[PDB]
Design a protein around this ligand. Structure first.
Ligand SMILES: CCCCCCCCCCCCCCCCCCCC(=O)O[C@H](COC(=O)CCCCCCCCCCCCCC)COP(=O)(O)OCCN
Ligand SMILES: CCCCCCCCCCCCCCCCCCCC(=O)O[C@H](COC(=O)CCCCCCCCCCCCCC)COP(=O)(O)OCCN
Ligand SMILES: CCCCCCCCCCCCCCCCCCCC(=O)O[C@H](COC(=O)CCCCCCCCCCCCCC)COP(=O)(O)OCCN
Ligand SMILES: CCCCCCCCCCCCCCCCCCCC(=O)O[C@H](COC(=O)CCCCCCCCCCCCCC)COP(=O)(O)OCCN
Ligand SMILES: CCCCCCCCCCCCCCCCCCCC(=O)O[C@H](COC(=O)CCCCCCCCCCCCCC)COP(=O)(O)OCCN
Ligand SMILES: CCCCCCCCCCCCCCCCCCCC(=O)O[C@H](COC(=O)CCCCCCCCCCCCCC)COP(=O)(O)OCCN
Ligand SMILES: CCCCCCCCCCCCCCCCCCCC(=O)O[C@H](COC(=O)CCCCCCCCCCCCCC)COP(=O)(O)OCCN
Ligand SMILES: CCCCCCCCCCCCCCCCCCCC(=O)O[C@H](COC(=O)CCCCCCCCCCCCCC)COP(=O)(O)OCCN
Ligand SMILES: CC(C)CCC[C@@H](C)[C@H]1CC[C@H]2[C@@H]3CC=C4C[C@@H](OC(=O)CCC(=O)O)CC[C@]4(C)[C@H]3CC[C@]12C
Ligand SMILES: CC(C)CCC[C@@H](C)[C@H]1CC[C@H]2[C@@H]3CC=C4C[C@@H](OC(=O)CCC(=O)O)CC[C@]4(C)[C@H]3CC[C@]12C
Ligand SMILES: CC(C)CCC[C@@H](C)[C@H]1CC[C@H]2[C@@H]3CC=C4C[C@@H](OC(=O)CCC(=O)O)CC[C@]4(C)[C@H]3CC[C@]12C
Ligand SMILES: CC(C)CCC[C@@H](C)[C@H]1CC[C@H]2[C@@H]3CC=C4C[C@@H](OC(=O)CCC(=O)O)CC[C@]4(C)[C@H]3CC[C@]12C
Ligand SMILES: CC(C)CCC[C@@H](C)[C@H]1CC[C@H]2[C@@H]3CC=C4C[C@@H](OC(=O)CCC(=O)O)CC[C@]4(C)[C@H]3CC[C@]12C
Ligand SMILES: CC(C)CCC[C@@H](C)[C@H]1CC[C@H]2[C@@H]3CC=C4C[C@@H](OC(=O)CCC(=O)O)CC[C@]4(C)[C@H]3CC[C@]12C
Ligand SMILES: CCCCCCCCCCCCCC
Ligand SMILES: CCCCCCCCCCCCCC
Lengths: 201, 201, 201, 201, 201, 201
């Protein structure tokens, strides 16, 4: 029966959250991790081995691949999710330590403190999501073409190179974009709810 | 002995379900995951490495493979099962939170609320199953041929390409189709049972 | 001490079983899974990479391998064991739910029902085992030859192809055949025992 | 504190065993599994990929490798250890069921039975160990040479083939032989001890 | 409820630490391990297979790769983190044994001892971090170029070699540098806090 | 609270050990296993695939690699650590059985026995460490060169072969040597401490 304290921690963490936000956002996180781990990761395995270019010049393939893909999508998404998730872990740790301190105080001697941190955490989650989306839009966009044109040394003039699994990667990119937009919308809804409940005093 | 609450949750979740539906559908889910994870996943490993075409044109193999297989069957099935499974997780979370709230109410102060959500969840499960089946039928069908004809640039004119393990993949496709049909039938039976028990009032 | 209920479930499941059948069949199942997972699976890894044919015709190797091996032995055995095992899982789930219902009845209000299902489960186990054995005999037999003759398009005339690790695979095939025969014999013995104890009334 | 029953089972299983046999044989089993899993398994990975022969004849490498290595050492040892280990599992299951039955009898109604089975189990362990050793001696011996001579069709006349990592495999073969001999000696010692304690009555 | 002793150990370990240092440094450690394990490790997989040089001389690629990369970044970072982490494990073990001894003393008979060790541990953590940073700066720097010039035997004169994924590796190098700097700053802050609280007596 | 017996076993095992030896040696063991498993194992993966020799003679590479590396360093270290660790496991098992027997005696009937075994275990640990170090020194030494000269049949005259990652392997070899020396020194210190405390009687 060593689970009541965990329930108390869960209740105290979600004091200012809405009823449906909990379920929707947690299930979205689970869906995100499962999709990233099971199917998405396997499709990018042969991203460089199957990358080919039409030329006899040694070294052109390496530089052209580097230019086309400065960073892989999967690792970009891993960084995105880690950055989005860290603030909640920080908040949980802070709440745990605060609860221990309060237990000490209330045992030995038989708003604003936490609300501000929660608001800051939600704001930073949204900011990171938006920043990652903007960076992805600026760098790659939201689609991939089968043929790429390379004009980098030591390749002479321009050369044509061919990618691997472009359509499938485009589909998964669209899926991840939709997931990110949904998460951002839910966080914004939570912010509006907290502010609109705080205005009434 | 910290298991009674889990039993209470299980009983409350399955209030409106039939006796045999529980067992049949749960065992079907276990069978589905085991089949997808153990045998099916390994057969598609060399889907692109062993794919070959008769030509000297560089890049033709990549584009022809992309055209033939816009998305792999295994990842399509993973998406299908995730979409079919998420609604039950949402319902479980909702029931858990509702039970906690009711415990609070009934401790401190010593139909339609949940039935509608259950019906909606079952309906969405069936809808997703049917939609995925229709998409699969429209895109690929339910069989694979050994020889494929490719007429995409930069391949000149038309070329012939050869697949890997077509018969085995066809067999597994038929198996998965049967599993999906059985699941859809069971969900429809559950819907009919709930409606026919609700008509009598 | 939250294990007495598990013992009650175990005792109720094995009410009509013999003393030695439990041990022999469970240990046989463990042996089967270990043998299939540790050694058998690794020997078939290079089943297609090491498959070679004497010809310059592109695509002949793919079609000849597909014709020779419509389905791999390992996946066939995985399907066989899953089909043989599912009925017991169904019976366990049914017994669990029945026990919960009986506990409810006997707490709030302080043969043939299950025997038939057990007999049906044993019969279906035996039927599946026999059917899989017959299919394997019809398709492949119980041995593999080092040289295969291929007469499928686009291969011109007939060609000779060579397999990988035929003797070892033959040995493992014989092992699995013996295991299947032993399991079938044990199930038949259980059926005869139950019927011969039921005749006496 | 749900561990006393496990201790009772352990004590009842080892009623007729010697003091040091327990420790020595259990640690030997752990050593065997660790050695087989960590280092031995990795050395045989490139057993066929690195196998090469001096000829242009297609298919000669496959048949020559099959002739040289009808079965791999690692899988042979896996089978050996499984066969040696199963009897103890059978004995444990029998003891568990017997203990449950005796508890039932002694609760509701408030030598030779097991000794024979234990002796049989030890005898079968020793017999399997000796048989596997004899088979290994007859087939391969206890050493491997770097050069192999192949005289099987379709190879013309005789050809020379070269193995991978012969010295390391020889070293590990000697290690496993020593382990098997030690296990056999310990089992024989246990048999002699039980018989010499039973003679005195 | 066998968790109170763990809480006592946690409280005693963190007696002299600041409130926010706990959370920030622990979350930083988790972030570090996750980043090193999920994304960073996969990008260096084809570090040598995809490394290519322009020459027909056999053996030049091996020596040139060895000269360019005396040690991989990932393994260097693994060593760095292990060295940074070991002192805390030592301190935890010492505290555990001291607590057991004190419990013995205070049951049977019904500053400076630990502060010095904690200060030493923090100092060694910082020293190791700084030393690893200096070594990395001296050997590689904090960037990678696409083209490398090799002048080692048996390569004739000088040759040009090409790396794999230079930009992505540079990005991850910068990330790890930032993480290391943050950790060093936090440790220095902890040292200053302890000394400034000890000066006041 | 089923952990007191584990604490009693831990205390009884470490009756004659020093205060700091426990922590230092246990942390050294953890460091050893982590270093061997995470970084060291990956660097030797392409030990044979990337091994190349300058010749057209088939089979020369195999024999030259076998001559250069009769056994891999990683597997040698695995054997070393297993041999060093087994005696402590034997001692733990002996202590466990002795404690059970003493509990039986002291419940039903309401130095030198163990010290000698502990001394023997420490001595054998040190002996194995020294023997493995001597064997490694005699066979390989403590460094690796980039170029190897091979004079084994069927290679004609002498040939030059090139290794993979020599500098990194040398670094790790030095690390492991330092670890082994530290462990040997700690064991010798423990032996001296026990003897010097036993002399005083
Ligand atoms: C914050 C957490 C970061 C998440 C993250 O990035 O992990 C990715 C997925 O990992 C993962 O979490 C992989 C999850 C694998 C789950 C597979 C089995 C689940 C089936 C469900 C059980 C049903 C009962 C990394 O990517 P990576 O770790 O995969 O890349 C390594 C391939 N070596
Ligand atoms: C909702 C859950 C999603 C299920 C799902 O898609 O997982 C698939 C199977 O994973 C899996 O669940 C793999 C299951 C592996 C089980 C193998 C051992 C079970 C034996 C039974 C024990 C008997 C006692 C993914 O596919 P993937 O994760 O395999 O692809 C990665 C290869 N790296
Ligand atoms: C009903 C259950 C289905 C059984 C089944 O088909 O699983 C096979 C073996 O899985 C398995 O169960 C693999 C078992 C691996 C066990 C290895 C370690 C056991 C050592 C014993 C511990 C002693 C203490 C699948 O085949 P697959 O999952 O292997 O194919 C995937 C390679 N990725
Ligand atoms: C475990 C820690 C030992 C503490 C202990 O005494 O546990 C005993 C159970 O034995 C046991 O601990 C048996 C557990 C067996 C599984 C643990 C080993 C796993 C790996 C084995 C690989 C195969 C070899 C109970 O004894 P008690 O003091 O409560 O006396 C009760 C007599 N009425
Ligand atoms: C009866 C049991 C059969 C034993 C058996 O044959 O298993 C072998 C080793 O498995 C194994 O048991 C592998 C054991 C792997 C252990 C590695 C980590 C242990 C480190 C110790 C922890 C210290 C704290 C199979 O061979 P295989 O399963 O390896 O072949 C599959 C490669 N996919
Ligand atoms: C866990 C859930 C927290 C609930 C909880 O309060 O547990 C406390 C133990 O702290 C802990 O929970 C410490 C557990 C440490 C391991 C869990 C983290 C694993 C991953 C860490 C990676 C490295 C960073 C006990 O506190 P109490 O309320 O009973 O007060 C007793 C004071 N006398
Ligand atoms: C001190 C500890 C040393 C840390 C360390 O160096 O481990 C690295 C990462 O290991 C790791 O710790 C790998 C972590 C893998 C985690 C993937 C799944 C986590 C998803 C989160 C779950 C959310 C719920 C080694 O590198 P390596 O072990 O990877 O190299 C082996 C590839 N065979
Ligand atoms: C006595 C025990 C023998 C130790 C031993 O030799 O195991 C080595 C390392 O195993 C291992 O123990 C591998 C350890 C892998 C740990 C990776 C994740 C740890 C991160 C820390 C978590 C922080 C929270 C074997 O080598 P091998 O088993 O690797 O070779 C197999 C690659 N298939
Ligand atoms: C090695 C271990 C320590 C890493 C995995 C453990 C934690 C990092 C896990 C446990 C619970 C997880 C959280 C569960 C659900 C949410 C949903 C979501 O949080 C919300 O803002 C939604 C509201 C809520 O669910 O509380 C963002 C991810 C997050 C914080 C997860 C982030 C990762 C967490 C903290
Ligand atoms: C990382 C973890 C959180 C993912 C795995 C845990 C859950 C997602 C699992 C636990 C129980 C599973 C469920 C068990 C059985 C069913 C059968 C089936 O549900 C039904 O409608 C049948 C009726 C019933 O069994 O209740 C559909 C899948 C589902 C919900 C499963 C979906 C996945 C669930 C929710
Ligand atoms: C992911 C999890 C849910 C899958 C693994 C759990 C179950 C599917 C396991 C637990 C116990 C296993 C059973 C243990 C032993 C038997 C022996 C045998 O059953 C018998 O008819 C023998 C008589 C008996 O042992 O009861 C056939 C396999 C079976 C049912 C096993 C089938 C697989 C079972 C049900
Ligand atoms: C998937 C699971 C069910 C497989 C692994 C669990 C069992 C098969 C393990 C648990 C304990 C193991 C046993 C522990 C130690 C011994 C030593 C040895 O037995 C003896 O005769 C020595 C005397 C003794 O230790 O009792 C032979 C292997 C054996 C039986 C082991 C065989 C494998 C056992 C039964
Ligand atoms: C196989 C097992 C034994 C290895 C993994 C277990 C330990 C080595 C883990 C458990 C807790 C971890 C610690 C948790 C957090 C910190 C943060 C940080 O410590 C600090 O100085 C911050 C202050 C604090 O958190 O106490 C440095 C890493 C460290 C000690 C971790 C190092 C690795 C530790 C000791
Ligand atoms: C599959 C399982 C059974 C294998 C892993 C479990 C054991 C083999 C582990 C548990 C505790 C480990 C021990 C923990 C620490 C030590 C340090 C060291 O022992 C000492 O002499 C130092 C003094 C001490 O720590 O007691 C040598 C390794 C050893 C015995 C370890 C050897 C491996 C042990 C026995
Ligand atoms: C596999 C080896 C063959 C095992 C067959 C053993 C069958 C013996 C049955 C004993 C009596 C059961 C009631
Ligand atoms: C061409 C030589 C084939 C030899 C096959 C021998 C296989 C023996 C299998 C024994 C099975 C034992 C049943 C458990």
């Amino acid at each position: 029966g060593d689970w009541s304290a965990l329930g108390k921690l869960l209740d105290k963490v979600q004091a200012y959250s809405t009823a449906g936000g909990k379920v929707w956002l947690s299930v979205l996180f689970i869906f995100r991790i499962l999709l990233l781990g099971t199917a998405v990761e396997s499709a990018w395995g042969d991203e460089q081995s199957a990358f080919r270019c039409n030329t006899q010049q040694p070294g052109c393939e390496n530089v052209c691949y580097d230019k086309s893909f400065p960073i892989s999508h999967v690792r970009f998404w891993v960084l995105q999710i880690i950055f989005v998730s860290v603030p909640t872990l920080l908040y949980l740790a802070h709440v745990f330590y605060v609860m221990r301190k309060e237990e000490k105080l209330n045992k030995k001697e038989e708003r604003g403190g936490l609300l501000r941190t929660y608001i800051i955490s939600i704001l930073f989650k949204s900011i990171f999501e938006v920043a990652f989306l903007l960076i992805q839009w600026y760098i790659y966009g939201f689609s991939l073409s089968a043929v790429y044109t390379c004009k980098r040394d030591p390749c002479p003039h321009q050369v044509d190179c061919f990618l691997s699994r472009p359509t499938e990667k485009t589909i998964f990119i669209i899926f991840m974009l939709v997931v990110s937009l949904v998460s951002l919308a839910l966080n914004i809804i939570e912010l509006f709810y907290v502010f609109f409940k705080g205005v009434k005093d």
